[PDB]
Amino acid sequence: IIGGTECKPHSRPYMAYLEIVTSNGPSKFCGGFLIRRNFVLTAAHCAGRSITVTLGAHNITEEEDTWQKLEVIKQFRHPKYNTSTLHHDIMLLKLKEKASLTLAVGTLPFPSQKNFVPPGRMCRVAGWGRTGVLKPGSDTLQEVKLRLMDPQACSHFRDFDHNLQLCVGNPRKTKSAFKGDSGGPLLCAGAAQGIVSYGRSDAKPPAVFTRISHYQPWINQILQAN
Ligand SMILES: CN(C(=O)c1cc2ccccc2cc1C(=O)[C@@H](c1cccc2ccccc12)P(=O)(O)O)C1CCN(C(=O)c2ccc3ccccc3c2)CC1
Ligand SMILES: *[C@@H]1O[C@H](CO)[C@@H](O[C@@H]2O[C@H](CO)[C@@H](O)[C@H](O)[C@H]2NC(C)=O)[C@H](O)[C@H]1NC(C)=O
Ligand SMILES: *[C@@H]1O[C@H](CO)[C@@H](O)[C@H](O)[C@H]1NC(C)=O
Ligand SMILES: [Co+2]
């Protein structure tokens, strides 16, 4: 998160920290959020050989009794996820066991395909991503308020599609989601509407978020079958 503030510890109980092991190189991390006791929603580009989810955290390098760490047993990348168009950057993760719901660990619902969030309103995103182009990922969970922009604001992003993605962050400000925040949810009025997908390597807003509403049917299918 660029230009955000540290969250009040445990104020966003649905936040999930993902530690991903790549079939080949260094490990990496992403954000995500609990939509069911045993399911976490995140970005498809965050997939890997194996993933461990940590719930109930704030300072990810400091274990707390609120922590619930669970191994992912199944990765469900959207079938149409495309690395060229970067469309459908969404994925569901099934946890080895159901997490226990506590004040520090809770679920968040996903929106209906009929509910299309239009440009103009203010939302917020949280994450453990880098706080600058040359800064490491934040130890603590950060959050920032960002403006939902007209899709035209994201025309410089190849294949940007208003029906599938959200254009987030006023370009005349430096505040923005950034590397490491991927997979993390964008909340507008307390309801999840997007998933951090990608943006400029130089961290300049706006960034691209997956429009969650568009994938409700797909999400419900997976939940039904698992
Ligand atoms: C240098 N960058 C950034 O510093 C960056 C800027 C951002 C700005 C705003 C919001 C989110 C952002 C996320 C990132 C990343 O690098 C992500 C990340 C890491 C690795 C592969 C990823 C694949 C798809 C989406 C995010 C990915 P990360 O957050 O997972 O680590 C980004 C610039 C634009 N990108 C690409 O053209 C791109 C597309 C397909 C790819 C497929 C395989 C490998 C690399 C790839 C890179 C992505 C990296
Ligand atoms: C996040 O947690 C870690 C681990 O507790 C903090 O790192 C330590 O920071 C303290 C500051 O009181 C230092 O005295 C130690 O030397 C550090 N040790 C380690 C393990 O690196 C880190 O500062 C915390 N970050 C915050 C609160 O922003
Ligand atoms: C990604 O979509 C592009 C553009 O529509 C298409 O050419 C390609 O087949 C897709 N990616 C793959 C190889 O699945
Ligand atoms: Co605490």
**89 and 126 housed in the same domain:** no
The H or E element containing residue 222 is helix 216-225
**120 and 191 housed in the same domain:** yes
Method by which the coordinates were obtained: X-ray
Q: What are phi and psi of 15, to 5 degrees?
A: -65, 130
Buried b (16+ CB within 10 A) or exposed e, 160-181: bbeebbbbbbbeeeeebbbbbb
In the annotation, is 45 catalytic?
yes
Please give the resolution of this entry in Å, rounded to 1 decimal.
Answer: 1.9
What domain count does the chain have?
2
Q: Out of 8, 58, 60, 61, give the residue to mutate to test ligand 2, the one with the largest number of ligand atoms within 8 Å of its CB.
A: 61
**102 and 113 housed in the same domain:** no
**64 and 138 housed in the same domain:** no
Structure tokens at 171: 């370009």
**134 and 54 housed in the same domain:** no
Buried b (16+ CB within 10 A) or exposed e, 147-157: bbbebebbeeb
**Which residue has tokens 């109930």?**
56
**93 and 81 housed in the same domain:** yes
Q: What is the CATH number of the domain that holds 48?
A: 2.40.10.10
Domain range for 133 is 1-12+108-213
